[model samples]
Target: NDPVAVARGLAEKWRATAVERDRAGGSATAEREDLRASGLLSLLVPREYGGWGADWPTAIEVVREIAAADGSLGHLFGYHLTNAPMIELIGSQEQEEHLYTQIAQNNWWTGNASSENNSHVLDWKVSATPTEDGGYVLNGTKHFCSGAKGSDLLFVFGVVQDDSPQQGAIIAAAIPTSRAGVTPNDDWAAIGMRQTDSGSTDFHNVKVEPDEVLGAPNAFVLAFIQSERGSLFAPIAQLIFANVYLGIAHGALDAAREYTRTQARPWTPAGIQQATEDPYTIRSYGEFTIALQGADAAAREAAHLLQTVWDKGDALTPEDRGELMVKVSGVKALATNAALNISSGVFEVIGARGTHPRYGFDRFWRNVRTHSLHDPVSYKIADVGKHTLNGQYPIPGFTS
Candidate 1:
């Protein structure tokens, strides 16, 4: 099936039921099943593993389309696409083949547990103790564990105490959530994107076999940090964020247009026939569309660059990856500002009656507001400025 068409169709389905879904506590089980049935979860898997053999551009566009309809599902879909390739980046060929194939065959969704609560970016607080028999036992808690519920596989990252002299090396390995020591918490409750199911998980003595380890301690750092894929993840993630919020912005505009056409009445003053004809409403919408268009263009430009390197794969040098990183930062920052503006400003076009509870227009603003906190937009702007002024690329790290 055409991935873009499939995404548009799914967006229509999700948008039709968004209000009802939000009222029902915003659970995403039904939407997730929709994604599975659409065959989108397998976009990142190799074709040999029953996937569509799609590239990063397709993935970014499809994600943006879905996000426009439902921010929660978009976030989940984007994360699934990310974690699948992460296995390949962080694991050996043998591990990647085994897990990727299994995921493709079973239609499994991957979850993450890489960061600790309140820890700085790249901080390793989770500890893995070496067992006497040369096995590994994990003990830690990971917050914001999105898509944990109903996930078949979870990629957990931590430090192994006895692995090396660098205060233990950072290690990442895949753990089946169904394992004995894995527990996913249902404590997630947020004002926006409630359907994300981004809860917490506790790992208490979760035993992992030696072969299950993704790579050597600090393997992720040595292998990908300065490599193309390492830097690629951040840009890809930022782009996904850009699209998800963009979708919300578009949703708000759609709702406002509908309300203005059918429900909204013109304020009594200059004798306008309808709200749609009101000069202020027209101007507001015009500005909103222009802003959204600019953001969309930037996102597409960054995606093209990402697709180039994604096709080039390991052949891409660090400089090439860093250059793309800079471009994506501008894209992300611009998109973030655009989404926030549109999501919030569209209400003016909708008028006071648009705030009716049944309309659920605030979901757009709330969702964008909540998810944008994933990273501060100010830093992204700074990164872009640094690149523009000094001709310097962002250093490889989280969010850069």
Candidate 2:
């Protein structure tokens, strides 16, 4: 029912109030309500379960639209959309159907607590102990648990303590945030994306029954990268990130164009009254526009490829997946560079007056810079180059 219009309206409102949201530094109640009411939280859920059941392209576009207005919300939206499918990938048929239907009906927000305070992307400091009743007790501290405050359920991962089919494997389970031993801390303080609430969660012997366990041991690491159903995870994630950065690029341009038209005065030496009329300002816009166009094109192409591959389902091959991964890597790297360039360069076009913190325009740059650190773009570029020169598929790993 006109998802684009709904997203645009929410994005505009979020943009208008972004300054306050950034100052507050966490999930906004109004924004969350808007998301819930918009039916976007269930966008990817199965239609039989009362959701839009849209494909990857639709999800990517929705995220891009929202991100163009607010980077933090865009981050949340991307995380939400990607994480929604974990149960299907890792859970038993019964578990998948149960949780997916529940999420679709309730439109619940899911949070993640797999990443640790200090660990590599695939490293796990958390541990799970088996209990007598075939249940497990979790103990660990997970950082960067974004949107933990308002989540109905949490997906947590840790290394299993005992020997099993996937002995010493990194296993994942779903736990209710209201569980007694679960603690969602308010400790997130970063340079940007302040509204993400990407804090920490402490699980002190939190109990998870066997039914709550998502996949078999190490499923997230093994099956997610190795299986056909899992191949899409990396590309989809990269696409989401790329689109978010693209949106930030557009947002920066929007702010710059507006300021140049309505507020920025022409440089004294430019011999023009309006900044928009200045040739230098015009050239800067043109350059940034061209850069953004290339980035946007790459991002969309990657998304389309992802959709095509995703529609192939279990028939997807390693070569097909690897090629898509390479393409997405290029898009991600280019999009990150473009976003950073645009976000930072826009200030030049807008001039010193734009530096005023009240405008909050710098948030675009800060957000892109901070989030881009999710993975180094250099490695992404290197991977693309290696693939092009040597016909090597990127090694299967978290960052790949």
Candidate 3:
């Protein structure tokens, strides 16, 4: 139970500190550095490569527990996971030696740089030109590069000549943030998950040697395309969001009950009616709770299914992929909606007084509302529909 018990203990400490400092209370910035220095962020590093060598499931569990208290930490975990696994998956032994050992010894947090302005999946408008020396000179802006400011390495994407129009014909490379032409802009002004330094990064003639490249010249598209295949990228993002919202909702509910028991009138105007005793409130609470449970189950299943499919290398037929995507998209859509619903319900049943900014009920809604926009649920629904019925797939491309 060392991992489980220790992780849980860290979560409890984070929550207590968050409640105390109002950082995780939807008011201020949550410190990613604190968690990193605590060794919690390095939990999944591979031992062979000098990482803890933990599995994906272990990392997800740790993220879930921490995120239940602070969504920003969960968001940070996504950044960490996205790039850390790549070192083992794609890096050469020498590269892994330099990166993984650097992390295990120095405990650095690596991140990715895939998203770019005016682009979606499989549509990376960012271009990388190969130089005479066979190195790459990157020139473009990658928007919303989470943790870029502090990231040790950035996996940048761009188009390359591979004789195919599809995204799988692209190239991917890693660039140290300290590169001369690489610039990280610290403009992460946001309404939720504010602690994450989610901002834009610019690469102007940034040079990287061949060893810096991640996958094969054309294999980068597969890397980007397969992102949605599992819950690791988008779906896991939704789950992390749901975890935070659930925590917020649970906190709101606790506050409402405590207020009613200690300060509010025990009896309402109606017969045999305490606010808690009100049948209408009770029924609504039950309904909202059911929705919350469904959302949780669906999110878990989506995450598991996606990861399972990838790990097993089970023949991923187009039909099979479509089916799984629909499940992921629908579950995420429902989960966010459920959180929004439950948070709203808390405000409605608790009354106007509970909705006060100072009281923090509305903060829960604001936090979830802001974070839900990180990757819109509406867009997920549309993609799911397109893939399911129109035969439009999120193939390896800039906008996959």
Candidate 4:
């Protein structure tokens, strides 16, 4: 209920210390507690499963709202919401009920450790050895393991040991971070997104219960293929990036406006006393405003497309999915550019004084730079353009 309002309230509080937290480059333990109490963590979970049971629009808006204050937390929050619903898409009815209940009731903050060390389809960094009990003992390492630190649960992917039942099948599981043999490397060394805690984590014989298995029958590949819902996870991930990036842009622009109105001084031109009155500043801001408008519109359209496909569930048609890919790619491409440009260009509006480390406005640019690189916009644009002109669609499957 009123998740946006709650998020806004939390954002106001976080904005005050955001710079410090970004500099601390560690866990946001206090702010994370705020999130735990806010109930937004359960925003995407169904009410029956002890959550708000809200839709994509509400979830998306909540992320954007918090993102306007702290991109690190915003990125983390948005990613949680993005993966929160994955159980429904890939898990069994019983599995969904059980796992979703654990999330909602336990006030769990979820993260993922799914990135393989390499791009080859057959090669996996994390390998799961089959147990006599039909469970898995997870080992190996994962990269770009965002939210690995300070998470209650982690969604992990690994290849089942070869020659075993469904050997080489890519397995997905939801397991506790506190489990024995699990280690968070705490090695996300990106200059930007300093506090995202996206580090490498090593698993040494971590146990994955059979009940925790997603898309089981050792047929994760086949089970994932049979559902139209499966296609949406990766695109939903892109939309999460789009919304957070746009929010970062909005945060920078919002800060720049206040800086211009109150603290900034007009350039040495005889025409103006107030910086806000300067014609050149107005022109500079003019483009920022319009850019934000278009980015917002694209983000909204993408959100709507995701919602439409989500509601379709198993019945999503090829055309529906095609349209989703086209729209999502367009928004992602634009949001990245807009966020990057505005985050940097805001310095022009606010002048050199805004560059002061005390103001911490640089966090906007840094966060945007780090997070937007999650995917490339060039390929995004290429796919959308190919769809529009040639009627060719990206293969309906996972994006990353």
Candidate 5:
């Protein structure tokens, strides 16, 4: 999938100006426009809907290339792809037509408002009340809604139930970001992925039409859990993130190699003329490279199986579905932690250059450090472990 071409081209265009965004503290005008024209943004939507309809593997490869060149852009784009499939899975024909036209015409972005302030995925505290006009009034706020400053749409979730005295149900709603009742806080400042603008928004009695609701009345919960679990976006997101760190690691390694080869002092420690000539440096680089290869191999395998299953659609049985979830979990954990280890190892090999703010090696470290906190490997590992040993992987969508 020529992701490298797309990513490298974007990198060449943005290379001089990526640092500018760092100083500007967020996205720049040029960056936004360039992304819109790059054609990378249209990988998910069908060709009929004005998108590339590139399928899962192609999308993953595209994102990976983008991340390898620029982590910030990859992070922001990954979030958009992650939330978009939800709309495709549950959106009504009318909603899809309306939203897809806007996406195709303007190349706008989207932000996911899933995580609440108090609890994370498993427990949803926000509740929606049924309106007299067959609508919904949602009152709650969400944290970490990325790209909200520029996104044209926002998909918010809540617990929607029926009006029956003895019956209840839960559902998720897709709300327009520009609505009167929805409030956006664009002042997103974070340690890493700051360019993403992942901020919070307050939904105060936001109105939701019937068509805005996703899935069946009482089956929303089950559908949501299944959809989320079945999603390939998480694994793809991990690969893109890992690609960014991998680039940073390679950059640091290049610096170290150049420093040792060209600038090393003539003074020898036990007769070594240059640091690059030292066997220790050679062995260290080789070991780190091997580790990265192993991680990449595992990630590629996972991505392949995921794509195969998704392309086959509902032909997969219950066991196939569960296996797919496990694959995603395994890949996510492997890629994230491996990247973390590789980045830290680069610092050790590259010396003080890795620590300098100007060199930006610390940014790589800090980026991985902070982003890893989003979905802890511990929880994912536990899920996989339980699935392997106990025949009980948390049912896809059954959240905390």
Candidate 6:
């Protein structure tokens, strides 16, 4: 089953409701079900566990296609793909088998409840007290818990209680979102990417079994970070960012094309009968197309490179990891500029009527503007240029 085709079909439906759902500024409960029903939620899970065993490239394509329809839904799906296979990467053999199997069969939706301001930004501020039976009771508050509102499973990072085993180490665990004491604060009221519902969530002594813990017991997560395998997560996320923004730009251009063909009129000074025939309008569209296509080509190249490195499995080396970070950095910067450019350029092409709420063109700019803030492009440009001069790659970090 072609996952991209399925995603395109779903995008058509979501695009129809994009304006209204965006205005609602709430969770995407029904849309999450659509993802589950289509079975794309498990796109990255291993085939042995009942999934299609797709690769990052395929998942990236699916995410991009969905993003073209609605930026928020794309954000939701892409984040789910990122969180879905995390267990396979960080969990023990038994944990992988158990959780991966359930995820594949049920098409579970997953998200993280960690934030940048927190100690473990990619990972949590929640403190976990160890029990005599090797269990844990978690209690704390975390903000910017993206996708937690409708996730079936959540990866929560916590600081081990003082004087306890692995004290001060950041340990992450996969837990059921419905578990007792897991509370959603529903305070996300952002200007854009509104549907993400990345609000604050509070955990009050939630019970965690030993089996719920990922990797080694009392072991710090940095154990995996020592390897290139752990560092792969940041690159994957940054690439996802590139694709989503690219998709938003693509969507903006498509909408502009439609409006120009019908709604937009030619200016009198040009003496043109149709807006499509205006020389200036035609040239602007041509430039937009060229910019977006350049980004698209680079994104595909980066995706292929990621596939090659990821297929190396345990053979992935630090050098291999650095190359990915270096290569994706250029692509991410290019896509961000193209997306922001095209999204704002649409107004210049479509004119005053484009501002009407009925068209809802602002979401594209808002989504990319909000999402781009995740990691600034200036440093990415600096990283690429610095690498070009010295041949060094960025050290592995949460947002590299």
Top TM-score: which candidate number? 4
Clashes found in each candidate (C-alpha, N, C closer than 3 A):
1, 0, 18, 0, 3, 0
After superposing candidate 2 on the true structure, give the runs of residues whose Cα lies further than 4 Å from its correct spot.
115-123, 162-166, 224-227
lDDT of each: 0.79, 0.81, 0.61, 0.83, 0.63, 0.82
User: 1-400, model 4: which lDDT tens digit per residue?
Assistant: 6889999999988877987887777777898899999888999999999999988888899999888888888888888876667788778898888889999999999988874524653576888887788778988888678787888988888887678656767788889889899898867777777777788889999999888877764343463354367667767888888899998899999999999988998776666777888888999899999998998998998888788898988898767777787888998988999999999998988888777788988989999998877766788899998998999877654562
Clash count, predicted structure 5 = 3
Give a tens-digit lDDT track for model 3, residues 34-77. Answer: 56666755666667655566555566666666555555666666
User: How do the residues 142-183 of candidate 1 rate in per-residue lDDT, one tens digit apiece?
Assistant: 766877776888878777755345446666778787988888
TM-score of 2: 0.95
Candidate 4 vs candidate 5: which has greater TM-score?
4
Candidate 4 regions off by >4 Å? 217-220, 223-227
Candidate 6 displacement at residue 61 in angstroms: 0.9
Give lDDT for model 1. Answer: 0.79
Q: Model 2: per-residue lDDT, tens digit, 1-400?
A: 7677789989877776787777677656788888987888889888877878888788888888999888888998788787767777667778877887777788788778764434543356567877778768888777667677678878888777555554577767887788879998878888888877688888898899889987766776776467456546667777788889998889889988988889988777746877777888889999999998898888888888887887786688888889999999999999999999999999888888778878988899988998999877898999999999999988755567
Mark the regions of model 6 whose C-alpha exceeds 4 Å error after superposition. Answer: 115-124, 217-225
Q: Model 6, 291-375: lDDT tens per residue?
A: 9889899899999998998888768987788888888998999999999999999899899988999899998999999989887
When summed lDDT is taken over every stretch of 10 residues in candidate 2, the lowest stretch is 115-124
User: C-alpha displacement of 400 in model 2, angstroms?
Assistant: 1.0
What lDDT, from 0 to 1, does candidate 4 have? Answer: 0.83
Residue pairs in steric clash, candidate 4? Answer: none
Colliding pairs, model 2: none
lDDT of 5 at 56: 68
